[PDB]
């Protein structure tokens, strides 16, 4: 939580810093206009009453020492520079937000965790080098239609189950929302009873346990996106409003 | 070496095969006007090529006009040539020949007529 909170405040710093160097488009448009009007212009002038290609009339300042060519090129240069810095800040934003979402899913998992997956999560983070110092993957209980629904509170074990423990046409059931675990039955194609029973297991281990308005997303594993870690997108999906449940979900 | 030998050989070949040919300068004109001439003679089916004076002479004897810049136009023609000349007027139309009969400037003009 310290790291996630830190990253959130980090991007807050970056965002409120970003609001003070955003003069790119002005310089772009100025360079455009100057290159368009590079024949009416003296070298030594301060200003330029110029029309935009809505036919306003803009007065662009100049360097009275420079040529219009030099001046317009300087505007293009500043556009280039602001463009570069904004690209940098946006990349840092993307990094920080990826990390924050990673840790948010991680905290969801840790909330809906078992020790067997916590032992894996520790090694996952030591691998991520936030920390320092083999087939058991999934955990299941009873389900509707006398079925078995497997899950993993660990991101790594969840991915292992989603990839190596089922096919493409099988169904994955998870949150239709921000953060929750990932779980499914082996070739999850059972009845609507099991479809609604999986929603209870989803809402139990979620970002908001005991939340009585949590929608679960059920989608074919064939559209499970294996794109940080556990940044899994989904398609071929439907969604159903559901709620948490008791240990009868077992 | 033998390459130049082959070259003069085929030049004499196409020479003796033709029975109308014209000998002109290519100087003081751009590649655009040149290729204009080339295209109108392509559709005229009148061949036109560019050779060196020395090897050209060797092919002929295998005369005075053969010096200086010299391109050649075979019709196995003079009309299109003189038309281009009246158009542009930076040329020499120095010589011609027909059936091996050396044609004068006025004579190639008359064939153009």
């Amino acid at each position: 939580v310290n790291e996630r909170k830190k990253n959130a405040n980090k991007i807050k710093k970056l965002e409120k810093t970003l609001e003070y160097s955003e003069n790119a488009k002005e310089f772009q448009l100025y360079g455009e206009l100057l290159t368009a009007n590079l024949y009416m212009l003296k070298k030594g002038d301060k200003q330029a009453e110029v029309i935009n290609y809505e036919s306003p009339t803009i007065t662009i300042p100049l360097n009275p020492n420079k040529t219009p060519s030099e001046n317009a090129q300087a505007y293009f240069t500043k556009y280039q520079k602001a463009k570069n810095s904004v690209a940098v800040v946006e990349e840092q934003i993307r990094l920080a937000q990826e990390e924050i979402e990673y840790f948010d899913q991680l905290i969801q998992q840790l909330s809906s965790a078992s020790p067997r997956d916590i032992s894996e999560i520790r090694e996952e983070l030591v691998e991520g080098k936030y920390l320092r110092p083999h087939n058991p993957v999934l955990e299941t209980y009873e389900s509707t239609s006398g079925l078995t629904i497997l899950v993993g509170k660990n991101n790594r074990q969840n991915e292992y189950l989603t990839t190596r423990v089922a096919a493409r046409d099988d169904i994955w059931l998870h949150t239709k929302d921000i953060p929750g675990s990932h779980v499914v039955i082996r070739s999850s194609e059972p009845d609507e009873q099991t479809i609604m029973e999986a929603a209870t297991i989803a809402a139990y281990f979620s970002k908001a346990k005991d939340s009585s308005s949590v929608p679960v997303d059920y989608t074919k594993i064939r559209h499970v996106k294996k794109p940080k870690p556990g940044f899994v997108t989904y398609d071929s999906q439907h969604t159903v409003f559901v709620t948490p449940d008791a240990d009868t979900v077992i | 070496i033998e390459t130049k030998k082959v070259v003069v050989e085929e030049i004499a070949s196409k020479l003796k095969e033709s029975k109308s040919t014209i000998i002109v300068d290519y100087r003081g004109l751009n590649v655009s006007e040149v290729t204009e001439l080339r295209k109108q003679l392509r559709e005229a089916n009148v061949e036109f090529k560019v050779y060196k004076n020395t090897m050209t002479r060797r092919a002929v004897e295998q005369n005075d006009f053969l010096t200086g810049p010299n391109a050649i136009a075979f019709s196995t023609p003079a009309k299109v040539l003189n038309d281009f000349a009246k158009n542009h007027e930076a040329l020499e139309i120095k010589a011609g020949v027909i059936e091996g009969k050396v044609s004068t400037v006025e004579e190639v003009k008359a064939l153009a007529e």
């Binding site: 290159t35 368009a36 024949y39 009416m40 290609y53 | -």
Partner: protein, 132 residues
């Protein structure tokens, strides 16, 4: 003076305004004249030549579109290859090769259809297109 201008779009100022502001002629009346002649596929980047005598006697000539334009319309693509001969990403048909050939026969030097085709094939090599 050459200008690469879409047909129906005349007086999108910033490229073209300078193109004649040195000449000092009426930019916009000329532009709408250009549209009037080029009542064509808007976006078809026509090569238009312009020649102004010193007294402002301007006369302009529209011409066939570029090879890259015709080939990108053929393949329905936006861009040629960023690294042709390392990543070919486009393809069109020999029939279309014939078509663009027969189109721009009037302008080229090559009296031969097939030689004009070879020219377009070199263009296709340059822009990352294969032929089928």
């Amino acid at each position: 003076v050459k200008l690469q201008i879409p047909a129906g779009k005349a007086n999108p100022a910033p490229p073209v305004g300078p193109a004649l502001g040195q000449a000092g002629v009426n930019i916009m009346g000329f532009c709408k004249e250009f549209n009037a002649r080029t009542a064509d596929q808007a976006g078809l980047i026509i090569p238009v030549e312009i020649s102004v005598y010193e007294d402002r006697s301007f006369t302009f000539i529209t011409k066939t579109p570029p090879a890259a334009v015709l080939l990108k319309k053929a393949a329905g693509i936006e861009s040629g290859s960023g690294e042709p001969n390392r990543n070919k990403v486009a393809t069109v048909k020999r029939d279309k090769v014939r078509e663009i050939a027969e189109t721009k026969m009037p302008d080229l030097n090559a009296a031969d259809v097939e030689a004009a085709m070879r020219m377009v094939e070199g263009t296709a090599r340059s822009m990352g297109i294969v032929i089928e």
